[PDB]
Amino acid sequence: PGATLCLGHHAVPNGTIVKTITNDQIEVTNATELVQSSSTGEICDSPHQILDGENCTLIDALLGDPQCDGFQNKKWDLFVERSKAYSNCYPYDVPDYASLRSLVASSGTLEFNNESFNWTGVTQNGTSSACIRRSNNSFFSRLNWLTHLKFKYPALNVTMPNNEKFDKLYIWGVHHPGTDNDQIFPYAQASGRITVSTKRSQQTVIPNIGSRPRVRNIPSRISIYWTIVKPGDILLINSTGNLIAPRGYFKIRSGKSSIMRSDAPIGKCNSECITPNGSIPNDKPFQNVNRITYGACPRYVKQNTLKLATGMRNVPE
Amino acid sequence: PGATLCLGHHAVPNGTIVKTITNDQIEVTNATELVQSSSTGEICDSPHQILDGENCTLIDALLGDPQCDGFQNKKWDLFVERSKAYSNCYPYDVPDYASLRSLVASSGTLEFNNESFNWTGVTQNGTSSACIRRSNNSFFSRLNWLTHLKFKYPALNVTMPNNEKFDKLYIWGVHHPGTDNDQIFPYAQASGRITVSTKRSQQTVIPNIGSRPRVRNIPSRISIYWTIVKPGDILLINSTGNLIAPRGYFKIRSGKSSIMRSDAPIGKCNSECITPNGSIPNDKPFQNVNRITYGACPRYVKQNTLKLATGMRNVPE
Amino acid sequence: PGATLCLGHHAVPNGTIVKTITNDQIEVTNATELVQSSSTGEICDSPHQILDGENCTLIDALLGDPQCDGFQNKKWDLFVERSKAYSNCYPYDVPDYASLRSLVASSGTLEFNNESFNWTGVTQNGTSSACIRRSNNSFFSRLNWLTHLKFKYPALNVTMPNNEKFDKLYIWGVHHPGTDNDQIFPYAQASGRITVSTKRSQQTVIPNIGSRPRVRNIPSRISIYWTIVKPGDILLINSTGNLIAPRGYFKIRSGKSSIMRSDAPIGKCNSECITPNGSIPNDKPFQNVNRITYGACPRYVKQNTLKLATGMRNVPE
Amino acid sequence: GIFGAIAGFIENGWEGMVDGWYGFRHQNSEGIGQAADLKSTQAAIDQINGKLNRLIGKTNEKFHQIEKEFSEVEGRIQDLEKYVEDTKIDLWSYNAELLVALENQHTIDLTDSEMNKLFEKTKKQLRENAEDMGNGCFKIYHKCDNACIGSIRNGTYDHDVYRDEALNNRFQI
Amino acid sequence: GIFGAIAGFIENGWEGMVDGWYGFRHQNSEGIGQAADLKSTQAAIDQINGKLNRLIGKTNEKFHQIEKEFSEVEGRIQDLEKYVEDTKIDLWSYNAELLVALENQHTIDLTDSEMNKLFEKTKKQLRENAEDMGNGCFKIYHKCDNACIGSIRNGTYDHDVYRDEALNNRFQI
Amino acid sequence: GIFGAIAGFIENGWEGMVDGWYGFRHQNSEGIGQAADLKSTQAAIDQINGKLNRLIGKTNEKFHQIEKEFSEVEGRIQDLEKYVEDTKIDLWSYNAELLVALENQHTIDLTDSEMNKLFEKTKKQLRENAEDMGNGCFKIYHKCDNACIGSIRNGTYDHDVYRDEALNNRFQI
């Protein structure tokens, strides 16, 4: 008579297909997805400090466009710029715009200390019809538009030493007037010139009279430049006209901060990983949502799915 | 009496050596080469659209050197520049030559639409002994050399709006005359100046009188610049002398196109992968022919051979 | 009666823990460290040719600051710059300092051939109180400060052809005088201008009068530029003032050379791999000492230890 | 598959075993039954969880990086930025593909291994009292009630108790 | 090599087997013969073709890239361009070296595995009618003509038919 | 662990074996002894040295590279330089982690394999003269003095010499 004893293993009615070294399709009892491929669509406001730029670029908030007055002295882990943003102050450009944007984004603060520059011999606080603050003609909050006093503009030669323990970041500019009339009216002489220097650096800028296509009815332009000044070093501004001057400096830090272009809304929720499509969970090691990420994120890969087997081969009955 | 039954496996008289994790030399019955290490030496004319530059660089065909007149409005997947190429028109340079070359290469077309610029007050179509087209004195086909009319050169202020649905690419220049005689003769005044602007951009260029070492007997130079103009935006040229002006614009596309330096001849044959040494087959996953490739190519590695075993270990009799 | 025969394996009293695919902690009989994590602290003087910069940057030795006179015509595999270094000659800057430093470092020689430039009509060998050589007023050894002869400075137009089989590297400059007094005293006229050209290139530089913050009591500056001249090509210097001229050229080679910032001392010892913390052994495949390395070095990884098992699993008695 | 048990000499899995990954089926005087082996089940599961611990929830923080989308044509420097990111992405994509493919081969092999070890362990336990039928089953040459079967599953089977009965049945004519 | 059959207890391969990778040699009353086993041969071959399908003809298209050769010295930006490409090339070169070395170890092991499974399958089939000589051969303790040998190769051998003959021959004095 | 010998059916290692990695312990009429097996020991050691040859002393020369530390804020180009180096370092760090983890799994498995092959080889050698106790030990059913044990270790044991003695002892009542 006797007995029979059989060794065996389980199987399931609903197997899944995985790839192996020797076979692109083998069925296993169970598997798990290694690529994150979806977001809810919202950028979670925690645990990172999000600053929604809304109608403002980082640069506009930096320069102090009036609609960005709400941004004075703010900090961020991540600054979010919106595609609907637009400028509504004096037309400008920034040679190496991308680099200034990057270094501010990365510093992660708009903290601004005012400084009293000795601007004797000129009229301060120039304004315009293109930069409206509280219905009045105004200007960039962080910039100081200098014009003649009593139809005269002497050689400016102004110093500011950095005796602090941090770098100072100075933002300044040059007015390119639209016609010959707008070079003689505010500065009282045919040709401006600006020279911003330190012990280690010098930047010289020649203003350039001529019409540009009008932007918000204005055919002139401002060109923005920057200068970083170290401890023990000194800022020096020689100018003979056309100086758009600083009112002080920005603190430049180092840290974890950055900037991201996205139109995702901000949600009240907690998520370590932000993409431009929204926050994504970070349990999986890979993701195909976006190559642009911030925080503790899965790595971007081209694949849409990668199944890891978590069970034996499925051999149905 | 009984019987004997032996289990066994094949072997071959001509084994090959492969590497493993535990042994740098083990003999297997068969193997396959994973690194492609040869070309036939010819760039196959299919399936990619090849444009042989012959005596012309991409930039020369762009600017319209007369020996490149055959290239007007051509397209390419891959533009091939030859080491024997040379310029035979007015000596020039391009600040950021590499970038203009790259963006044109990548656009993959020389399609040019002419435009009627209002150049009243100056003489158009300047020519020279250094740019011979059909035995006559000529110039760059896409450029318009502007000089005085009746020994006078007024302030040019010319506009061209982009009301099209694509970007326009404008190429233009500045003549640097070789002596004081060649600044007063064609422009009628001591100092030129050029300013090309848009709503988002401005480029200003000061001509610079002085001798350069002669190139094809000419000691003057042209400096080439470019401006991209978006839909809704407008081009503006202020000039007081020395403007080498556009006759129109180039269509700038995005796509799969590029450029490659090679002296390989073009063959009537079909191959997906092009290197500068010639086309190579793309069955293998790796290749050590060239780090420069175009198309569906094996990846470049430093090794000359990598044998994958395709049979068991060989244990001879 | 009979016998018993047991098969078995060794074990050790002192096992070590390694990581595997399936277990982060399994004990094996023996293991070896794959990450090099220490240096002795000294840069070994063999087998690579080390040049200790001591008080001098590569650029100072290039330009010929008097405290760097010991460096004339030296070669190196690796140039070591010290944090204590400092300049003690005429204050200067280099637009694209990083690139000049890099191309010299990489050339790996300061070999300098003098050349006789025809500088008739001006006074050569200008000197200053800020550049002391052997208690006397001096200048940069490789530069030639040109001033007026008999209160006159004619248009210089000087040529030097490269008929050699190697590239020539020319270093030159522009004096930016500190006031109007120091533009008229040495050059005898209101505005200098420099134009260095070749058949393939032109660089033009406008001097710029104005005070900078004083560096070692001097408020003026020199700006350094470079020009490479190929075989068959020719150097041309037009100048109307302010030219800090070359005395000749540097040989520019290609090879294995580079530069490294370190304060490690130089030892009499032999080591293929140099980091800024000192030389490290290169038996291991990985290292976490420094991302900056020179020579035959283990690859930098973030981990501090990686144990490879070199024995079986340890299963104690 | 490399050991030959799962999808080899064991013809198929058992959908009716839901309390374990590996186990035993028997027929004796008292009927036909099934029981899961927990030790071999847990051995496989621990190994798979080990791989999961190395992959799930182990991400790395990045902050300010480079730009990866562009509104203007710029040439050289933009080419380099795009090239760096495209290079990076192909290398990680390669790492991910290889990882999954290697881990999956190993998971399939380790699970077949657990099946094989259980079978071998059981074969040794039975000594001369049983023969291997070649399909994962042992013919046991003695009366083996539910407590006896239980004793084989619990590692307490004393083969000397039944040896005489079994040798007599095995080497019959 | 990890299973111990190829270049282990099987002393060498057979150059005279050209119709398969694995097979059987026999000596009986009717002479000495050879026959390939197709199933184990195809099992090995399918697995190797699986690796080939993942490596051969699977390339990725690239178009405009960066410059990789230079006629002028430029410094900073050229250094970065060269560094990026050199970085990329070392990483792929590493991937290729590792891939081949791992795949080759696995191919050698999977082929030894196929040999081992065939041997084991045959051993179980023979039951008590044969003993393992230790070198891949079975001594069969009964008259086993060409049809009987054929039946072992085709999986149709009925061990009960010969058992009495075999036990008598095996446990002789 | 994948073969089931080390940390499986062999309960533990032997700290008293210092002249080899694998070996034999015995009890017979003449006492209780130990001897290392050199061939299986050397087989494991050769394989591990093979991995070491591929990792130790195989470094690649690099010379002028890019800058990796910076004293000034510069933006775009510095971002790209830092990003390239950070990318590179994560990829190598990944390669190193994977390498060690895979090699370690394989070393553990190859060493268990060597143990298993020795056990199997010995089992076949003994033929019908011994039975497997299930814990790495064979019960040998005949008088087996030190020269006989020696002969099993040296591959010279003639099983026919003792077969009659052993079958009589094995199939007793």
Ligand SMILES: *[C@@H]1O[C@H](CO)[C@@H](O[C@@H]2O[C@H](CO)[C@@H](O[C@@H]3O[C@H](CO)[C@@H](O)[C@H](O[C@H]4O[C@H](CO)[C@@H](O)[C@H](O)[C@@H]4O)[C@@H]3O)[C@H](O)[C@H]2NC(C)=O)[C@H](O)[C@H]1NC(C)=O
């Ligand atoms: C198919 O394979 C996958 C992977 O092996 C497997 O999914 C895993 O299952 C376990 C258990 O179901 C999950 O573990 C949970 O994780 C979450 C956190 O994300 C916890 O909330 C859970 O905690 C429970 O238990 C705790 C007590 O021990 C309590 O604190 C708590 O109240 C919960 O009850 C639990 O730890 C694991 O997350 C998944 N993993 C993945 C990647 O999905 C699945 O079960 C397998 N399917 C089958 C049919 O076997």
Ligand SMILES: *[C@@H]1O[C@H](CO)[C@@H](O[C@@H]2O[C@H](CO)[C@@H](O[C@@H]3O[C@H](CO)[C@@H](O)[C@H](O[C@H]4O[C@H](CO)[C@@H](O)[C@H](O)[C@@H]4O)[C@@H]3O)[C@H](O)[C@H]2NC(C)=O)[C@H](O)[C@H]1NC(C)=O
């Ligand atoms: C160089 O050429 C450019 C391009 O032609 C030129 O810029 C243009 O200047 C004109 C004239 O100043 C601008 O025209 C104005 O545009 C605004 C906004 O669109 C209109 O509201 C204005 O309307 C008033 O003027 C009309 C004309 O008499 C009246 O009929 C009307 O009732 C209004 O009072 C007016 O049309 C034009 O906007 C710019 N264009 C651009 C693209 O900038 C520039 O002036 C030239 N440079 C020089 C130095 O001459």
Ligand SMILES: *[C@@H]1O[C@H](CO)[C@@H](O[C@@H]2O[C@H](CO)[C@@H](O[C@@H]3O[C@H](CO)[C@@H](O)[C@H](O[C@H]4O[C@H](CO)[C@@H](O)[C@H](O)[C@@H]4O)[C@@H]3O)[C@H](O)[C@H]2NC(C)=O)[C@H](O)[C@H]1NC(C)=O
């Ligand atoms: C050593 O190992 C290698 C790799 O396993 C092996 O080489 C391979 O052999 C096969 C068959 O000989 C090749 O397959 C051919 O591929 C080409 C396309 O490149 C086809 O033209 C062939 O088609 C034939 O068969 C078809 C019918 O099924 C017909 O349509 C046609 O008319 C042809 O007759 C065929 O598919 C394969 O390309 C190679 N691979 C490599 C990488 O070389 C080689 O055979 C092994 N050597 C030994 C001695 O076993």
Ligand SMILES: *[C@@H]1O[C@H](CO)[C@@H](O[C@@H]2O[C@H](CO)[C@@H](O[C@@H]3O[C@H](CO)[C@@H](O)[C@H](O[C@H]4O[C@H](CO)[C@@H](O)[C@H](O)[C@@H]4O)[C@@H]3O)[C@H](O)[C@H]2NC(C)=O)[C@H](O)[C@H]1NC(C)=O
């Ligand atoms: C600044 O210095 C440079 C370099 O010296 C200088 O450029 C040179 O100018 C001379 C004179 O104009 C050029 O000489 C000509 O070259 C051509 C081509 O090689 C020759 O065919 C010419 O020959 C004619 O003139 C001869 C002299 O009278 C006659 O004897 C002969 O029969 C011909 O009629 C002539 O030699 C020379 O080519 C350039 N060199 C370079 C490298 O460019 C430049 O002129 C100076 N600048 C100023 C503003 O003075």
Ligand SMILES: *[C@@H]1O[C@H](CO)[C@@H](O[C@@H]2O[C@H](CO)[C@@H](O[C@@H]3O[C@H](CO)[C@@H](O)[C@H](O[C@H]4O[C@H](CO)[C@@H](O)[C@H](O)[C@@H]4O)[C@@H]3O)[C@H](O)[C@H]2NC(C)=O)[C@H](O)[C@H]1NC(C)=O
């Ligand atoms: C634990 O594992 C490690 C790795 O397997 C192991 O360390 C290795 O041991 C050997 C021998 O002890 C070392 O080999 C030496 O290498 C150095 C060069 O660096 C040589 O000087 C040595 O040469 C000796 O022998 C030669 C004759 O054959 C003579 O020429 C000479 O005079 C020397 O006596 C020798 O080749 C090897 O370097 C290490 N490797 C590492 C990475 O440490 C260790 O032994 C293992 N531990 C145990 C307890 O088993």
Ligand SMILES: *[C@@H]1O[C@H](CO)[C@@H](O[C@@H]2O[C@H](CO)[C@@H](O[C@@H]3O[C@H](CO)[C@@H](O)[C@H](O[C@H]4O[C@H](CO)[C@@H](O)[C@H](O)[C@@H]4O)[C@@H]3O)[C@H](O)[C@H]2NC(C)=O)[C@H](O)[C@H]1NC(C)=O
């Ligand atoms: C633009 O503004 C800047 C900043 O104010 C200015 O630069 C400064 O110029 C002054 C005056 O020339 C410099 O003062 C000298 O500094 C040195 C070194 O520290 C001192 O040794 C000097 O001392 C002498 O002069 C004193 C004043 O009469 C005497 O009392 C004394 O006994 C000495 O004889 C003197 O103080 C100053 O160093 C610079 N500062 C900087 C930061 O460069 C510049 O001159 C202005 N530009 C123009 C064109 O006016």
Ligand SMILES: *[C@@H]1O[C@H](CO)[C@@H](O[C@@H]2O[C@H](CO)[C@@H](O)[C@H](O)[C@H]2NC(C)=O)[C@H](O)[C@H]1NC(C)=O
């Ligand atoms: C996340 O956003 C990205 C970027 O917009 C999406 O990728 C684009 O998808 C569109 C299709 O709608 C394509 O035409 C573009 O080529 C993609 N753009 C880029 C820049 O790659 C992506 O679809 C979104 N992903 C998820 C999961 O929502």
Ligand SMILES: *[C@@H]1O[C@H](CO)[C@@H](O[C@@H]2O[C@H](CO)[C@@H](O)[C@H](O)[C@H]2NC(C)=O)[C@H](O)[C@H]1NC(C)=O
């Ligand atoms: C393909 O062309 C490349 C580039 O010319 C060749 O690589 C050069 O080979 C020469 C030897 O003739 C070396 O001196 C150079 O160092 C290499 N140049 C570069 C830029 O790497 C290569 O030999 C050719 N390959 C084949 C398969 O024909």
Ligand SMILES: *[C@@H]1O[C@H](CO)[C@@H](O[C@@H]2O[C@H](CO)[C@@H](O)[C@H](O)[C@H]2NC(C)=O)[C@H](O)[C@H]1NC(C)=O
């Ligand atoms: C080698 O030198 C590097 C660079 O100085 C050291 O890394 C720094 O370590 C300090 C701690 O003292 C940290 O604050 C810095 O973040 C590190 N700097 C950088 C640039 O990474 C490292 O400690 C040294 N390594 C050894 C083994 O001596």
Ligand SMILES: *[C@@H]1O[C@H](CO)[C@@H](O)[C@H](O)[C@H]1NC(C)=O
């Ligand atoms: C199989 O079915 C169950 C019950 O609906 C489900 O929860 C489980 O996830 C399925 N498993 C797989 C691997 O699809």
Ligand SMILES: *[C@@H]1O[C@H](CO)[C@@H](O)[C@H](O)[C@H]1NC(C)=O
């Ligand atoms: C942004 O600008 C839009 C359009 O001009 C306006 O409707 C909206 O109120 C503004 N939003 C904020 C938050 O300032």
Ligand SMILES: *[C@@H]1O[C@H](CO)[C@@H](O)[C@H](O)[C@H]1NC(C)=O
């Ligand atoms: C410039 O503006 C600020 C803020 O509106 C004001 O307090 C300051 O007094 C103004 N400056 C002068 C010189 O009036």
Ligand SMILES: *[C@@H]1O[C@H](CO)[C@@H](O)[C@H](O)[C@H]1NC(C)=O
């Ligand atoms: C061995 O010989 C044959 C016949 O010449 C040949 O076709 C085959 O490719 C060779 N195999 C190897 C692996 O070299």
Ligand SMILES: *[C@@H]1O[C@H](CO)[C@@H](O)[C@H](O)[C@H]1NC(C)=O
């Ligand atoms: C290219 O130039 C060479 C040398 O001047 C000439 O011989 C050849 O005919 C030209 N080829 C073409 C295709 O124009």
Ligand SMILES: *[C@@H]1O[C@H](CO)[C@@H](O)[C@H](O)[C@H]1NC(C)=O
């Ligand atoms: C300039 O050249 C073109 C083509 O040769 C010609 O048709 C055009 O009329 C010329 N322009 C003028 C103003 O004559």
Ligand SMILES: *[C@@H]1O[C@H](CO)[C@@H](O)[C@H](O)[C@H]1NC(C)=O
């Ligand atoms: C164990 O002990 C010995 C003797 O002190 C030592 O040399 C050896 O390296 C140790 N092994 C490990 C793996 O720690």
